[PDB]
Amino acid sequence: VQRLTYRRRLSYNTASNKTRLSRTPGNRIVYLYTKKVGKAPKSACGVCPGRLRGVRA
Amino acid sequence: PRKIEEIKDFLLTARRKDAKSVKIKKNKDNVKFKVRCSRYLYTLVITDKEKAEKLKQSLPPGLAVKELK
Amino acid sequence: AKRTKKVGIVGKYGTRYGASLRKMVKKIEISQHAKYTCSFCGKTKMKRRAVGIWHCGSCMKTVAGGAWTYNTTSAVTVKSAIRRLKELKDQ
Amino acid sequence: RCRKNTLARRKGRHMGIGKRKGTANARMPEKVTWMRRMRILRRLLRRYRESKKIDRHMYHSLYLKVKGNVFKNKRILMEHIHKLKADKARKKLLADQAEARRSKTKEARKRREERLQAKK
Amino acid sequence: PGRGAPLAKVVFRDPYRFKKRTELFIAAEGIHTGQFVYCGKKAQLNIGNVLPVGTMPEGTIVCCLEEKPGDRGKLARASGNYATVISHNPETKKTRVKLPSGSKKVISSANRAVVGVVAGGGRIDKPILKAGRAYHKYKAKRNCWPRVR
RNA sequence: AUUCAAACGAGAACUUUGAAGGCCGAAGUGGAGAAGGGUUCCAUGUGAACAGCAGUUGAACAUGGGUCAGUCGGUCCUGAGAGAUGGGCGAGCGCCGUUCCGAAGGGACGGGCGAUGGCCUCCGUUGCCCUCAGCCGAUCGAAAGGGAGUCGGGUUCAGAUCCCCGAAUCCGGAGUGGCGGAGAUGGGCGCCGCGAGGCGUCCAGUGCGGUAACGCGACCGAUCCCGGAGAAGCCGGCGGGAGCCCCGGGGAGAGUUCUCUUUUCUUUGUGAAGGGCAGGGCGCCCUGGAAUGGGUUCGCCCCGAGAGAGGGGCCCGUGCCUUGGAAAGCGUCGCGGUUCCGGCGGCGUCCGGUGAGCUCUCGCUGGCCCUUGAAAAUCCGGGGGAGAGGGUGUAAAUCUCGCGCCGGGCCGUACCCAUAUCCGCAGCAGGUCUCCAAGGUGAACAGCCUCUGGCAUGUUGGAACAAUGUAGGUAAGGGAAGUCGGCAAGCCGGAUCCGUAACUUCGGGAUAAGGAUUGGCUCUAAGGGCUCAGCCGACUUAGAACUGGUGCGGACCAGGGGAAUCCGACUGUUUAAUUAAAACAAAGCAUCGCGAAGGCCCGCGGCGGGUGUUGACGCGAUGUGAUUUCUGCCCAGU
RNA sequence: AAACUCUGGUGGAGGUCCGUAGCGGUCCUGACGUGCGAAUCGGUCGUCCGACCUGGGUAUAGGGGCGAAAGACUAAUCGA
């Protein structure tokens, strides 16, 4: 199996260094540095545990 | 990239001033009409065979055509 | 089946900390993990979040309470005492 | 050569007592064995309630006996249902022929007073 | 962290500017979210109402008491503690209160306190069982724990 | 752990190529980084010195070469903290202190006046006056935290998310705004035209749909106000999606073919950013009203504060399809350029199945805390409604909609990253932070063997096989007689089925002790999905027969046991380099001080500082040391 | 009768046990002892979800610091 490496100079598994695999059209797997996942706004009522609808996270 | 589906807006984009070039990719089962504009590369894929050369001549003569293969 | 004879929740401590200390922590540790009935919504959901803080998982209402119990006996006598001096001052 | 051996393990060869190093729970965790069994049986009951073979009231009581580790597999449960469907169908026949005997004499009595209000 | 008694964010409506001032009281046991807290000289006498001591009757159980008028509370504010208004003195505007240590003190009548005991009482009853639990307790307060004699 | 042959050469155990035999064996002797080094990188040349033998080789020496960015980092933000000014102190260099003893804002909106520039239109610029303001502590502090936005293919002797090609994207800017679209174009009336329509007046227009959740491409608005995101611990369980592995086929090319094998091996793809759909999630809505309670999980959990059952909505979609995109990549077959060649062609890049599998990730749900698990920059929404705009039109103000145009500076970027590029005086068995992780056996990231990749046995060879060593072994009969002492070695060892004492804080002790079994082969039984029957699918357990020179956890991996005493309850810690303990800590117990002008303590000094963002359930100072059971007499001395 | 008690599952607590990486450093009083090494090596060992291990940033400076306390550590230097 092909083992692969990082592509930046950050060699630690920090929260800003998260990756996902990707098969390129050149028949090779590479890393693709993901974006941190967003969160939809929490209600201003401060009591509903869920999050708002109709707005992008 | 942006896929143009219906036929008449393609020539509407083809006559834009920023439309630099058009290319004709004639593969099997399709004939795609790639037109390079400033921000995107609009594509018009038509499954018909003869309707392609129904339009291949309909391009504005100023814009450079390119038979791609 | 009944797994233990007389060692309840504190069975997790094994053979440590001595018998009396493992016995007087049992009455407390049962209490601080029990779910109480929320006096606002009625559902049995009052559960201790942190020490002194009790949250109801249903009406989402937080209550300042005792450290290991929902109500301290010293508090309930004070609430009833204040309630008597209150109506006694204003008459 | 590996393929030739795994084909023999499928037939149960090389898996005797003298070729097992991990405990039975390590080779086959009893939690996932219990998981497979629950998901299977709960799914079976969920089809029977869906196909009207059993009702809500039998489903609920039978659901908990599954959770109580009463039925060992799908066949043992499926046959236990047959005995429950049978006996209640007897009770359903026994409590309707007896109700027919009861409601018949009800109006057969009312027919009798019907001769009293007409002659008086 | 580092304090047994829980706190309570109480939001007021600033009387001079369009704004909402927020505070951190020391929660009196029985306080719940969405409860109205009243503060001042005309405030009624219920749990979680800070009002001047001179207005309270004798034997009133208070907490977060001010030791000097207007210092925002200094006395009886650990978990489960309280002070009692022992007696008043209309002239000279002074009041005797006993403290959780048993000491009785003569304070001014103007300084105020929230009614009721401090939440989180009975904390010292559960035995620290492990040396580890003690480590985590003091790791949140200050470097003082392992005490070589 | 090397061997054979060849080439180059004055010269070969050591260089290079080929072959063979081996090792590392994915927790690597592999592929990449941080710190550190600083040219060691790369090419050519040399063989003086150096590389503890040699050298035709080198990290040596001599010549030259080499590091390319709006998107990767720095830069920005704040963290623990550091540190100016005011102030205070100080003989003094200076020090304290960081919101405290301070006139700490050089900004903004609108209005008014004057003035200018461009078609002084209208707008911009400026001065003055008026009006408003919470700011709140200058500044520094992270190449792992926060932080918009770049990916695919190709290319070098050495550089590539940087160059080339092709696809994108973020931010910033735009009197005359560059163009569309939205704002937006309707109604009443009086006439004409048979009508179809068109006139002259009056009035409206800061969008629209859905019962709702909410939707639609935009859809005015300032100071102020509220909120959100940034922005959160550890652990367990389960689910989804990938990557890998595996299985059954189909091609292409290779290996084997003494015999057998429709065989064995390799290979068999699609980026970012859009669009659509699965698939996940929802404490989202509507109908309705549930006990004979039901729904439901591995566990739970949910319900008249609205269950089931229907019908919707939203969020994430990294998966699939599609634009990109087959043109490119790869695999083969062939033709060229005699060559210089991102040369040019031919087909191919296929169809399925599985899984407590592994890793990554997303999500749901619990557990634990006298532990509650960052800030700020930055960005967004809402509430308000001061204002602004045009009068039915070539409409105006205005637009977070579509497209077009311009710009993105500065610094780092080579290589090593470790049994030879770092630190240990050195090519030193030491030390030094991370990422990726194949097949078989197996519980397993164990050990053992192998593939991808890598290497030459660790600063030398040759010939012998003495004594003493060092490291491995084996020993008749006896079995600790040896010795300070069972030190050292040995025995035991996995799993399955049985069986398990004293004592006990009732939890343990416990894998107690003690037994039996274990291979190969051929079977039988049981355990599921999809449409009674048929069709698919996996592993696992139990039992039986036969069989071998009784051998079978056959290597590897892998607990000697018992009964008593002393000490310390336990886990933990400790004399780096002679002491790991019975010492220290510890929970528990008990004293002592203190209500803030305070206790304890620091400080040369100050309205100084720590505890203290504290307040007796607290802080400070001591002894003892879990539990159990107790803790006697002495206040003369000190 | 009740109080509840038994039996089988489920569940997955713990400064829980065996044990790898890691972090340690018990014994051989082994090797070495002008060493590979001004403290290393082999076998055997301790612990391995917690008072755990660790990088970087930051604070404490010499009669001072810091010390789960050995007069330990404070750049091979520590009763100054």
SS (HEC) of chain B: CEEECCCHHHHHHHCCCCCCEEEEEEECCEEEEEEECCCCEEEEEECCCCCHHHHCCCCCCCCECCEEC
Q: How far apart, in whole angstroms, are the C-alpha atoms of residue C59 and residue C43?
A: 9
**Range 8-37, chain A: CB under 7 Å to any strand F atom:** 8-30, 32-37
Specify whether the CB–CB gap between E31 and C64 falls below 8 A.
yes
Q: Residue E116: which of E80, E74, E72 has the closest Cα?
A: E80
The annotation status of C56 as a binding-site residue, yes or no, is yes
Nucleotide nearest to E131 (CA to C1'): F586
Instruction: Tell me the C-alpha distance between E149 and D28, whole Å.
Output: 54
φ/ψ of D75, rounded to 5, equals -70, -40
Q: Which nucleotides of G are covered by protein (CB under 7 A)?
A: 5-16, 50-52, 67-69
Q: Has C66 been labeled as part of a binding site? A: no
Question: What is d(CA A19, CA A13) in angstroms, rounded to the nearest whole number?
Answer: 9
CA–CA separation, E99 and E76 (whole Å): 7
Residue C64 CB closer than 7 angstroms to strand F? no
- Give the one of E6, E57, E126 whose C-beta lies nearest to C28's C-beta: E126
All residues of chain A having their beta carbon less than 8 Å from the beta carbon of residue C60 are 47-49
Q: Measured from the CB, is C7 under 7 Å from any atom of strand F?
A: yes
For the CA atoms of chain D, what is the radius of gyration? 28
| Chain C touched by E28 (CB under 8 Å) | yes
Interface check for A48 against chain C (CB to CB < 8 A): the answer is yes
Residue B68 sits at the vertex; the CA angle it makes with B65 and B69, to the nearest 5 degrees, is: 160
Strand B21-27 and strand B67-68: the pairing is parallel
Residue A28's alpha-carbon distances to A13, A20, D63, D72, E36, in angstroms, are 22, 14, 51, 49, 64
Orientation of helix D74-119 relative to helix D30-50, angle to 10°: 30
* Residue where the block lists tokens 């439309």: B19
**Cα dihedral angle (C54, C55, C58, C61), rounded to 10 degrees?**
100
Flag whether residue C60 sits within 8 Å of chain A, measured between CB atoms. Answer: yes
Phi/psi of residue A10, nearest 5 degrees? -90, 115
Task: For residue E11, give the 3-state DSSP assignment.
Answer: strand
Q: Could you write out the DSSP letters of every residue in C10-39?
A: GGGGTT-S-HHHHHHHHHHHHHHHPPEEPT
Where does residue E35 rank: exposed (0-12), middle (13-18), buried (19+ CB within 10 A)? middle
Q: Is A47 on the interface with C (CB under 8 A)?
A: yes
Residues of C in contact with A49 (CB under 8 A): 60
Q: Could you tell me the end-to-end alpha-carbon distance of chain A, in angstroms, rounded to an integer?
A: 36
The rounded distance, in Å, linking the Cα atoms of A22 and E25 is 54
**DSSP H helical ranges for chain E:** 131-139
Smallest CA-to-CA distance from E73 within E112, E126, E121, E127 is with E112
- Separation in Å, CA B29 to CA B45, D21, D76: 10, 60, 58
Q: Tell me how far CA of residue D21 lies from CA of B34, D13, D24, E39, in angstroms.
A: 64, 16, 9, 73
Treating both helix axes as pointing N-terminal to C-terminal, what angle do D56-67 and D74-119 enclose, rounded to 10 degrees?
Answer: 150
Q: Which two tokens stand for residue E34?
A: 């969405």
Give the CA distances from residue E50 to residues B22, B64, E96, E109, in Å, rounded to whole numbers and listed in that order.
79, 84, 18, 13
Residue D59 contacts residue D45 (beta carbons within 8 Å) = yes
Q: Chain C contacts of E46, Cβ < 8 Å?
A: 82, 86
In this structure, chain A runs to a length of 57
| Angle of CA points B20, B24, B29, to nearest 5° | 150
Nearest CA in chain C to E43: C86
- C56: closest chain A residue by CA: A47
Report how far apart, in Å, the C-alpha atoms of A21 and of each of A11, A25, A29, A31, B54 are.
17, 13, 6, 5, 44
Q: For chain D, how are helix, strand and coil distributed in percent, rounded to 5?
A: 80, 0, 20
| Interatomic separation, CA of residue A41 and C1' of nucleotide F446, rounded (Å) | 49
- A16-36: string of b/e by CB count within 10 Å (b at 16+)? eeeeeeeeeeeeeeebeeeee
What is the C-alpha separation between B24 and B44, in angstroms, rounded? 10
Q: Are C3 and C18 in contact (CB under 8 A)?
A: no
> In C, which residues are within 8 Å of A50 by CB distance?
none
Distance CA C31, CA C23 (A): 13
Instruction: Give the one of E29, E33, E57 whose C-beta lies nearest to C88's C-beta.
Output: E57
| Residue C85 to chain E, least CA–CA distance (Å) | 7
CA neighbor of C78 nearest in space, from B33, A31, E63, E132 = E63
3-state secondary structure (DSSP) of residue A13: coil
E64 contact C CB<8A: no
The values of phi and psi at residue E127, to 5°, are: -70, 130
Whole-number Å distance between alpha carbons of E13 and B63: 69
Dihedral in degrees, nearest 10, Cα atoms C5, C9, C11, C16: -130
Axis crossing angle, helix D56-67 with helix D30-50, rounded to the nearest 10: 170
C67 to E29: CB separation less than 8 angstroms, yes or no:
no
C56 and chain A in contact, CB less than 8 A: no
